[PDB]
Each structure stands twice: as structure tokens, then as C-alpha cells.
């Protein structure tokens, strides 16, 4: 998945998240977190959104 144009508007359980990668506001529309799902696919998420932060550092630990 290249860039993000729309964010997911539905919170995902961390149990369904394998890993994340960031994307930046350069050469690409909006800064976003891209979650790698337990089911292969990637979801765009809003880094300003709260559940995204908590998912990110849960994944880190």
C-alpha cells in the first residue's frame, strides 16, 4: 500500500494487528500509520487519533 487518502473510522483490536509502519507528509498526501493486519491487508489510520497511539506502543512492547 502506497499512500493514504482516507483513514479508517473504526477502531481495531490490537489482537488483530501484527505490526505498523509510519508514513510522512512528504512525497505523499497525509502523515499516517499503516497497520499490517493479522489477515495480510493494510489499514490506514489517523496518528492524531487516540486508539492508534495505544495500538502503536502496545505493538512495540
Amino acid at each position, epitope marked *: 500500500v502506497t499512500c493514504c487518502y482516507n483513514f479508517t473510522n*473504526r*477502531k*481495531i*483490536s*490490537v*489482537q*488483530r494487528l501484527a505490526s505498523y509502519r509510519r508514513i510522512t507528509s512528504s512525497k505523499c498526501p497525509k502523515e499516517a500509520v499503516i497497520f499490517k*493486519t*493479522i*489477515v*495480510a*491487508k493494510e*489499514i490506514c489510520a489517523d496518528p492524531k487519533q487516540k486508539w492508534v497511539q495505544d495500538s502503536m506502543d502496545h505493538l512495540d512492547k
Partner: antibody
Framework: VELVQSGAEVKKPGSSVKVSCKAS????????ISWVRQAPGQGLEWMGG????????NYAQKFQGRVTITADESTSTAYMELSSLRSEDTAVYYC????????????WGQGTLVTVSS | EIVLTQSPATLSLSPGERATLSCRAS???????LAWYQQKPGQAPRLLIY???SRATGVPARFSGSGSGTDFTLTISSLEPEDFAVYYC??????????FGQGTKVEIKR
């Protein structure tokens, strides 16, 4: 999103039944198919589900040794074979779509009646 | 392994009254991964509420769900007679083991 199931079956006790569910798309590259039954006047029982890009299904333990759930990518059809049939298997069998990353059964097939009797 | 217990078994209310249905779980359901279905006589179940509190697609405004952990409630604010149905709760946090509540019947009182 339509889920079109095969027609009603009649089976002798001890045999097996294979129910099909054709999903509108070729789009179980993003979703899975659940099988849920309901004996007359009874509640909903999960039986198992498959997310096709996993190649293998998960089963509810009440049916564990008796059920096989498969999926064929080319025809976008999911299947549910239940063997060693008893009268308690007399039920309406539904297929239902779900998202692996969530799980709510958002779209349902019309159901297949399976009647198990002598 | 998560057992859902719905109460009451049957709910009798006159039209316009408020309906409150319960789904208590034997374990904490982890990210509000709980759903409500409506089933009218001789019809396929219809999704009403997902994520415990999100009203589904083409669902009338009088239907609402809420709660988290083990205590979940479905609310029909002003009961319509076309709401005579059985309502089911469903956890989907355990992908490998989906479970359903035994169902609550909502009936019109006259």
C-alpha cells in the same frame, strides 16, 4: 454482496451433507465466510468459519470432529460438509460474511434447510 | 469458551414503551467486539449493532446498543409492533470461537 446458498437437503441419519454458498465477487481476498445454524424454534449456533487466504478453517468444538469448511477461490464459493448426521442436525444452515479484523456477521445467505431423518 | 447469557427470556411491552435487553458475558469481551442481531419469524438474522454501540446499516434510530467488558445492553427506545422478534448477542473477539447468546424474545403487550 449476495450470498446464494444451495437448496434444501434430506438425509438419512449417519450420512453426510455438503452445503454451498456462492459469494458475489471473487472478493474473499478481504473477508471470510461463517457457517451458522438454527434448529426449529432454537437459537443460533456457530459452526465454524474460513478466511480463504488462510486456506484453513476454524471450528466450534461441538462439531469439531464432524465438520469440514472449505473455500474455492476460482468460483468464490464456500462449503460446509457435516458428517455422522443426527436428527439434532435438522436445522436451517446459514452462511454469513465477516471481516477477519472485526467479526460481526454483516451479510447473510438465505439459508439451507437440512432435514435428517429415516 | 465465552458464554453469553441474555435476559430476560421474553420481554412483554406495549407499543411505545422502552425495551432493554441484556447480554452478560462469562469473560470480558476485549474491544467491544460484541454484536446484536434481530430475527423476525421465518427470516434470516439481521445485523443491528456492531462494536457494542455502533448502529448498523439501514437500522432505525430507535435501536441503540451500549456497554463494555461483560455488561451489554440493547435498547429499542420506542417499541414498534414490527419489532416482534428474537434478538441475539454475539461476541467475535475470539476469531477461533464465535459464540451467541441464547436469545431474548420481544413481544407486544396488549
Amino acid at each position: 454482496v449476495e450470498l446464494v446458498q444451495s437448496g434444501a437437503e434430506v438425509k438419512k441419519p449417519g450420512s453426510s451433507v455438503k452445503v454451498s454458498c456462492k459469494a458475489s465477487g471473487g472478493t474473499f481476498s478481504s473477508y471470510g465466510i461463517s457457517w451458522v445454524r438454527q434448529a426449529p424454534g432454537q437459537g443460533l449456533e456457530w459452526m465454524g468459519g474460513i478466511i480463504p487466504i488462510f486456506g484453513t478453517a476454524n471450528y466450534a468444538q461441538k462439531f469439531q470432529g464432524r465438520v469440514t469448511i472449505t473455500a474455492d477461490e476460482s468460483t468464490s464459493t464456500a462449503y460446509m460438509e457435516l458428517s455422522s448426521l443426527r436428527s439434532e442436525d435438522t436445522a436451517v444452515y446459514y452462511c454469513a460474511r465477516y471481516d477477519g479484523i472485526y467479526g460481526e456477521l454483516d451479510f447473510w445467505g438465505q439459508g439451507t434447510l437440512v432435514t435428517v431423518s429415516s | 469458551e465465552i458464554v453469553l447469557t441474555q435476559s430476560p427470556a421474553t420481554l412483554s411491552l406495549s407499543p411505545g414503551e422502552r425495551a432493554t435487553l441484556s447480554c452478560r458475558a462469562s469473560q470480558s469481551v476485549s474491544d467491544a467486539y460484541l454484536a446484536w442481531y434481530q430475527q423476525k419469524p421465518g427470516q434470516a438474522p439481521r445485523l443491528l449493532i456492531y462494536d457494542a454501540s455502533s448502529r448498523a446499516t439501514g437500522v432505525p434510530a430507535r435501536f441503540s446498543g451500549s456497554g463494555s467488558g461483560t455488561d451489554f445492553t440493547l435498547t429499542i427506545s420506542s417499541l414498534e409492533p414490527e419489532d416482534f422478534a428474537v434478538y441475539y448477542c454475539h461476541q467475535y473477539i475470539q476469531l477461533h470461537s464465535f459464540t451467541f447468546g441464547q436469545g431474548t424474545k420481544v413481544e407486544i403487550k396488549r
